[PDB]
Amino acid sequence: ANQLRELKQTHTYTVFGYTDGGFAVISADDLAPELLGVSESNFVETDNPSFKWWLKAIDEVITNAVKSNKPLNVIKPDPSKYAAEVSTLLTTTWGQQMPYNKLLPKTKKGRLITGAVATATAQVLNYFKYPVRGIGSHTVHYPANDPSGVAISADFGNTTYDWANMKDNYSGNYTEAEANAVATLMLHCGVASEMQYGGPNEGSGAYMTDCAAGLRTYFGFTDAEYITRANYTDEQWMDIVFSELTKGHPLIYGGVDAGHAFVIDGYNKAGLVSVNWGWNGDVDGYYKIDLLNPGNMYSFTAEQDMVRGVYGKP
Numbered sequence: 001a002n003q004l005r006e007l008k009q010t011h012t013y014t015v016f017g018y019t020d021g022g023f024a025v026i027s028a029d030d031l032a033p034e035l036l037g038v039s040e041s042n043f044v045e046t047d048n049p050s051f052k053w054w055l056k057a058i059d060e061v062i063t064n065a066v067k068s069n070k071p072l073n074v075i076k077p078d079p080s081k082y083a084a085e086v087s088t089l090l091t092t093t094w095g096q097q098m099p100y101n102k103l104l105p106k107t108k109k110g111r112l113i114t115g116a117v118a119t120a121t122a123q124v125l126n127y128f129k130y131p132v133r134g135i136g137s138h139t140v141h142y143p144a145n146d147p148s149g150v151a152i153s154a155d156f157g158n159t160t161y162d163w164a165n166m167k168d169n170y171s172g173n174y175t176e177a178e179a180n181a182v183a184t185l186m187l188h189c190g191v192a193s194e195m196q197y198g199g200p201n202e203g204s205g206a207y208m209t210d211c212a213a214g215l216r217t218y219f220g221f222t223d224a225e226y227i228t229r230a231n232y233t234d235e236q237w238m239d240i241v242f243s244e245l246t247k248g249h250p251l252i253y254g255g256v257d258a259g260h261a262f263v264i265d266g267y268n269k270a271g272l273v274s275v276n277w278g279w280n281g282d283v284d285g286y287y288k289i290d291l292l293n294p295g296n297m298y299s300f301t302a303e304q305d306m307v308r309g310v311y312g313k314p
Contacts, residue, residue, distance in 0.1 A: 001019070024039075039283055048279035077269070078242075082242040090124075093168065099179035100183060116203075118189040120261040138191050215307065226305055229306075238290050249308070250264060262277045
């Protein structure tokens with residue numbers, strides 16, 4: 001008999017643990033749907049920056065709904081148009097520190113970290129096991145604002161990505177070849193995205209427009225493209241999500257603090273999306289995004305971009 005145990009509470013949401021294991025994020029307002037998110041993973045406090053963004057965005061939309069006395073929308077996938085549901089596609093639980101960042105410069109304040117955009121992109125590329133090799137080469141610098149800083153380079157065109165050595169989970173045991181396989185991919189995804197690298201307490205930040213450009217140029221994803229939510233109604237945006245996942249295409253999603261980014265890799269019948277936050281599996285689960293309508297250019301909800309068009313070729 002599953003019961004709920006309060007773990008954490010704000011004025012807009014409460015995190016409740018489940019006695020069978022897992023947790024839910026719950027609202028309490030006539031203008032919001034009650035269940036906001038749900039995970040099979042037990043809740044533990046985590047630095048997960050992208051989950052932190054999502055909580056701030058939820059708080060913002062709920063408070064704005066209440067102020068404007070407008071119910072939050074609930075958008076469900078139409079099974080006459082899309083798959084009824086798409087269960088979580090990714091098997092990886094990757095993150096931004098060791099061994100993912102093994103190939104990045106060390107600093108007296110800790111080794112540079114991969115960046116959420118790189119971790120999300122690497123997990124999507126690994127899902128497809130594509131490309132076989134990249135194209136060309138590129139260098140960024142640390143600090144990013146110094147053209148003559150420490151060079152961080154990727155030779156994509158001479159790299160055969162070692163897909164067979166990409167482990168799902170690096171939180172316990174792994175070999176050096178498995179560490180190098182994923183670290184190479186992480187470094188290349190960052191350099192391709194024009195990453196602005198930083199140590200553990202600063203983070204590493206990239207723009208989705210640069211992620212999409214680098215995916216075209218250095219990885220050969222001809223169709224890769226960045227789009228931003230402010231250009232779409234909620235219904236139009238969720239139809240893109242449902243259509244892409246129905247086709248088996250996980251989505252790099254995020255926005256810009258070194259930003260937030262994650263992978264949407266499924267959805268359920270009630271329209272919650274499966275999210276891989278790229279924080280070692282911490283709090284991965286199903287979460288609402290339909291109700292995150294973009295606000296002014298300065299709101300948390302305005303920070304929602306996606307890169308679509310990433311998949312193998314016929």
